[PDB]
Design a protein around this nucleic acid. Structure first.
Ligand code: GFN
Ligand code: GFN
Ligand code: MG
Ligand code: MG
Ligand code: MG
Ligand code: MG
Lengths: 245, 487, 487, 247
DNA sequence: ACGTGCATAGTCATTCATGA
DNA sequence: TCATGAATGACTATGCACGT
């Protein structure tokens, strides 16, 4: 068991449960999204750590400079575990670390920067499956009489719309389908019923198979060598669609 | 270089600041209960079409529209004012429909302008109802380019409903919110008893307005302070939150607070108790836990020791925290450009007067417009009776000026009417189309007579205010939230 | 809970970010030389009517319009982008007419959004010329509500004129600005010699485009780097400021710097000299004084010691300061959704291609509209020839549909034409107006003939580009600022 | 007497002049970062220094001294002027013989003037007595003639006058662009500020005079003091006749 | 001494590539 | 290490009156 704040980051909205095994840390993008998340959460088991701005690239940046970064200190301090050789998983304050960023490309970028921080400083968190990715909604179908439905893809939107119309439901062509462009546009309720309610949230558990292959990919994509990265993108971006086919 | 004495400069400058702040910044107009920034935000959104019949516009667009046309000040503070008008715990009847993160009753600040959207609420649409029918005086904006309204129609008593608080110079205002249905009853009485004196009117209105109705619910303890505020314009109203004692399986007791008095920050409240615990002031308390959520609302659990009495701890909380706190009523509002402390019967009467003005002006507007339409229609009807000649005349004319000048002489018609004949489409020459022009004339002449009748009878005018207001209240009126108890 | 491998996530996420930044953020489209934010700001202002024919709008309104409809990002950085497009020391040909404090070449920051106003410049109006005539492909915005343009008509070569600098992922761009009159000559040649191969085209274009022309004036030393940039797409161009040696009556020679190379901060430049003199790196210097003002422009006076040679100190300044600095040219632009390093002959050719597309599309649009009006006009003329009959028919109809159906039968007419006859006013039945309808038909049929001729002849199409561009250059073209000298 | 100007122990916001002679130097105390920014650009850097003040100045009449000395903006003024305060006032150390207060023409500019004048009268009174304090009058309008040079107006009357005269002279204005109305110093650029408030050959300055010190002392205490009631009755008494002070 | 609400924005840290 | 330029806003202090 571990004490919750009521010696940790000021931005941290800690949970109430003293059991790390049941506790969760939502690492959120932005002050707005983190603010609403702090309200819509279950304060018993879910803690919120909002991160501001692009995270520093630990692959490029020198070690001492990374340790001076306020956002990195917040993560390391909140997770309770050390880093590198001084890493001790026994002091992990949350057995679930949910990264929650915007659906847009800059959210994706922040994900790669966080995953790089974790893989380089605190790899066992990934190996033991403590790291997860929340999938935010993209659309909210606002039926005239029925309860609203959330969609996490363009396909699902078309499907739920098709089904609802076939069922005899109806939507306004003005209000209609609200499209989310970021977590910051959502309120507390919306975030709960899509990303934080454990009975409805869509989480993806980060797994680590080949450590050596991963090590090389991280260094290529995140490293200082531009040429390697440039050729990698021009080589593989052509086939990014067909990774899960 | 001109010389100026410091006394002249100081006196002139400070008075100019004080007066504009009093009349044009900090204090509400008695008729619509709005400060200049509020009025300008709402009208900007209204004119931009950001209405409930359309999807929320980005709130940045509302701020920029307000800035560019009406309110020559910063975007930052204007956004704050807009945000306030959308918070359900600030306004008893919100005027802005907010979409996104607009903050909380605690220290959680609202999201930035970029993240949020906003539009007018249905009640705010009643504030602006028929504003385009010359129901209120308009004046040029800060640079003469466009017009802005001096006051809104305010088809429900917004000042008393939503209240107002403002710090001016040499004075300040603090009017609490009230329940719309109770205010309506008071208005209905004032309309029926339009000849009643101030003495009778105050007794009647005080009977219907039972007291302030805060958006945060809670309790009002006592009746003296309320009576003072309505009879004097000043009064101290004691507020309380609601506490429900819960027992535990072990047999431990805990106090559950689910409501707090108006304008009490939830986070500051919890912090205040927390600091007054260590500070060994509020003994008997064992543990403080905030079990609040978006689904259960406010829920502050105060577990007390076994050797502690619930009411003793509750009384200590009333004494040493804002669980019990008083609202300092000061009924100050701008009346005809002058700041004035008002009795409750004065507040109602001044609002009723405004409504009657609005209804008469609307009627006058509609009556003028009806005559114009009738005037042109009479011209068209004359053309139809001599249609063979009218067409032949226009055809044989070398220009349209010759045709027009001829039409006046032909049918003995004005130039406006003659112009309308020229602007007439060949569509309107069809059999059924000719008939509609006749019927439309007959239709309008009935409307004109009705309008003239309204202007001639104060009874109908008052009847309209009553009926239209009743419709609003039936649609937008809600239950009382704040419970009134005795000592 | 679904499992995902870290390699799959990393590769897909980073590639999606890199590609969006490359194609849709940091790098310019070759056809109009604009990044997405630039294009969206300008179109927002354009659609909002913030044009040179009306007074400056509050810049907050441009930001909010861009933010709310096209650019789903923050108001802060969008304002920065708008401001930069209004600075004469940043853009060789400013696209935004700024009113107020937009900063300086030094560390004086621009005023906040609330203080400044903005509208489009005349040249920016050429970027958007006839954009409403289907001259460019439009796509739905970020939420499907409205359409936005994929590219602007860009009736002057904006990429080469104003240049571009951008940091993307895996690559970056740095195109310098050029003199419009020189660019026009190159385009004029490309149009005349439309069949010339790349080798000839490169030689020709390089002869007319003498080199970059910076808004900050200064000097270009050497010709090698310029040649590399145009031949390779990469080159190092050495820039210099202007130094004028002045003598005193006491014998105190001083260096007066009146110009600096492109993108050199005035305040940083003075500080760099000052810090290099205090520590001891630029001996011979006695005193540094900034005599600059809004009335004389840049004027940094560097008084040197008596036992010092002016030319030595100037070379020391070239060596240890940005008085001499290189522009790292990397001619990278997006071509058909693909990032590409381009020769100068490729940049010109691609722009000329875009212009020809614009002119052909415009002609096709105008031809379609011309046919439509002509079609309706043909209907009107038929009505005029049988005017007596037309009226009699409409009169006997119970509805307008019976009247229409009859008109079709009477004159052999479409539903569109008959409807147009119905909507016709009695205004146009005057003598001159009937004649005006006739002549209008004759006019359009002449225009249609012209338009058809344009589409059938590439010669005319190229002629249009030349003549229209020539008109633009004669009106908005200016002298060269950057002087080109040899080693 | 001469004193060193800062060039790469004075406030960071201060854009000092180059002249080392206080008799020849001027300090423009400006309202706002934007206006101060433009002033810094349009000024004559030889004799004119700029000290921008941000926000409403602290009321030295209401706030206790220790709190006043901790205020960053007050410290900037005291430090820039070089002179001490109260008993430690030494006019010999005055770094500028002209202290121009330049605020917006609007109501909030007027308020900042009274707060600054209160600071000066209470902490550094001799500056007022010896005529080192001035008030700049910003322009309100800029008439943009189609062919002629633009004209600036400092009142509604002058606007009407210059408009009438120009039209009578055969000049013409656009009814769109037309007459630009200034709502604050922050809306002006460097050139405009020079040609209306900083060019010593065109600027309209007012020199603050102090006749009756005892009467002044009373007025400052009424208007700026902690006593609200006194202030309320003074405003309700005298605001009715603010028009007729110079009639 | 703190809350209230309408008035009077610059500073702070990262990604990313390239050349000093 | 620093500049470039579009991307990812909270904190900081006064006036003003009034009540605990
Ligand atoms: C809070 O993050 C930001 C920071 N900082 C503040 C201090 N901590 C660092 C991590 C981020 C900043 F120093 C500037 C900006 C900005 O300039 C800005 C903007 O819109 O211009 C937006 N943001 C936030 C994350 C989006 C900024
Ligand atoms: C620069 O002055 C301000 C200050 N502070 C910043 C530093 N200490 C004092 C001098 C003023 C502030 F702490 C907040 C604001 C604001 O919140 C604000 C706003 O638009 O809301 C405007 N301003 C400036 C003077 C107008 C503010
Ligand atoms: Mg985002
Ligand atoms: Mg603020
Ligand atoms: Mg920024
Ligand atoms: Mg102002």
């Amino acid at each position: 068991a571990l004490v919750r704040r009521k010696g940790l980051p000021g931005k941290l909205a800690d949970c109430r449960s003293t059991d790390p095994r049941k506790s969760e840390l939502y690492v959120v993008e932005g002050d707005s999204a983190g603010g609403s998340a702090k309200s819509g959460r279950d304060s018993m088991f879910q803690a919120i750590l909002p991160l501001r701005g692009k995270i520093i690239n630990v692959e490029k940046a020198r070690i001492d400079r990374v340790l001076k970064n306020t956002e990195v200190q917040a993560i390391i301090t909140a997770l309770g575990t050390g880093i590198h050789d001084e890493f001790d998983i026994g002091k992990l304050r949350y057995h679930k670390i949910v990264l929650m960023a915007d659906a847009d490309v800059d959210g994706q970028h922040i994900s790669t920067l966080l995953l790089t921080l974790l893989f380089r400083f605190m790899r066992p968190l990934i190996e033991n499956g403590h790291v997860f990715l929340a999938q935010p909604p993209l659309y909210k179908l606002k039926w005239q009489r029925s309860d609203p439905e959330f969609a996490y893809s363009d396909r699902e939107r078309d499907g739920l719309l098709e089904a609802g119309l076939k069922a005899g439901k109806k939507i306004n062509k003005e209000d209609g389908i609200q499209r989310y462009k970021g977590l910051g546009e959502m309120d507390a309720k919306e975030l709960w019923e899509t990303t934080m309610d454990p009975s409805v949230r869509v989480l993806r558990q980060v797994t680590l198979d080949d450590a050596a292959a991963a090590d090389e990919l991280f260094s290529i994509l995140m490293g200082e060598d531009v040429d390697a990265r440039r050729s990698f993108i021009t080589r593989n971006a052509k086939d990014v669609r067909f990774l899960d086919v | 270089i001109e010389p100026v004495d410091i006394e002249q400069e100081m006196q002139r400058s400070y008075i100019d600041y004080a007066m504009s702040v009093i009349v044009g910044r900090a204090l509400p107009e008695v008729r619509d209960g709005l400060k200049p920034v509020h009025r300008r935000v709402l009208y900007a959104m209204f004119d931009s079409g950001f209405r409930p019949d359309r999807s929320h516009a980005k709130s940045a667009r509302s701020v920029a529209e307000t800035m560019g046309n009406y309110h020559p000040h910063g975007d930052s503070s204007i956004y704050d004012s807009l945000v306030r008008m959308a918070q359900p715990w600030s306004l008893r009847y919100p005027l802005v429909d907010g979409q996104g993160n607009f903050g909380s009753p605690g220290n959680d600040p609202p999201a930035a302008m970029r993240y949020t959207e906003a539009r007018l609420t249905p009640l705010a649409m009643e504030m602006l109802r028929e504003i385009d029918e010359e129901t209120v005086d308009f004046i040029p904006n800060y640079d003469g380019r466009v017009q802005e309204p001096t006051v809104l129609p305010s088809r429900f008593p917004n000042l008393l409903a939503n209240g107002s608080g403002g710090i001016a110079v040499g004075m300040a205002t603090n009017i609490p919110p009230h329940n719309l249905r109770e205010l309506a009853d008071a208005v209905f009485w004032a309309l029926e008893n339009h000849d009643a004196d101030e003495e009778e009117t105050l007794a009647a209105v005080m009977g219907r307005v039972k007291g302030p109705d805060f958006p945060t619910a809670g309790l009002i303890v006592g009746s003296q302070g309320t009576a003072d505020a309505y009879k004097t314009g000043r009064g101290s109203i004691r507020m309380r939150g609601v506490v429900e004692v819960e027992e535990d399986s072990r047999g431990r007791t805990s106090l559950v607070i689910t409501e707090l008095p108006y304008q009490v920050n939830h986070d500051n409240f919890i912090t205040s108790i927390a600091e007054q615990v260590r500070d060994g002031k509020l003994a008997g308390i064992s543990n403080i836990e905030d079990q609040s959520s978006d689904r259960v609302g406010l829920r502050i659990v105060i577990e007390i020791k076994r050797d502690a009495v619930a009411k003793v701890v509750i009384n200590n909380l009333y004494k040493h925290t804002q669980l019990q706190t008083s609202f300092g009523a000061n009924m100050l509002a701008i009346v005809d450009g002058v700041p004035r402390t008002l009795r409750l019967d004065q507040l109602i009467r001044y609002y009723v007067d405004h409504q009657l003005d609005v209804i008469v002006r609307r009627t006058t507007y509609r009556l003028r417009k009806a005559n114009e339409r009738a005037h042109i229609l009479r011209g068209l009807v004359k053309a139809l009776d001599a249609l063979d000649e009218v067409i032949a005349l226009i055809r044989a004319s070398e220009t349209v000026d010759i045709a027009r000048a001829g039409l006046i002489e032909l049918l003995d018609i004005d130039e406006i009417q003659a112009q309308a004949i020229l602007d007439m489409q060949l569509r309107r020459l069809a059999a059924l189309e000719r008939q509609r022009i006749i019927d439309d004339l007959a239709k309008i002449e009935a409307e004109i007579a009705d309008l003239e009748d309204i202007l001639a009878k104060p009874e109908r005018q008052r009847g309209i205010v009553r009926d239209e207001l009743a419709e609003i209240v039936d649609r937008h009126g809600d239950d009382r939230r704040t419970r009134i108890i005795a000592i």
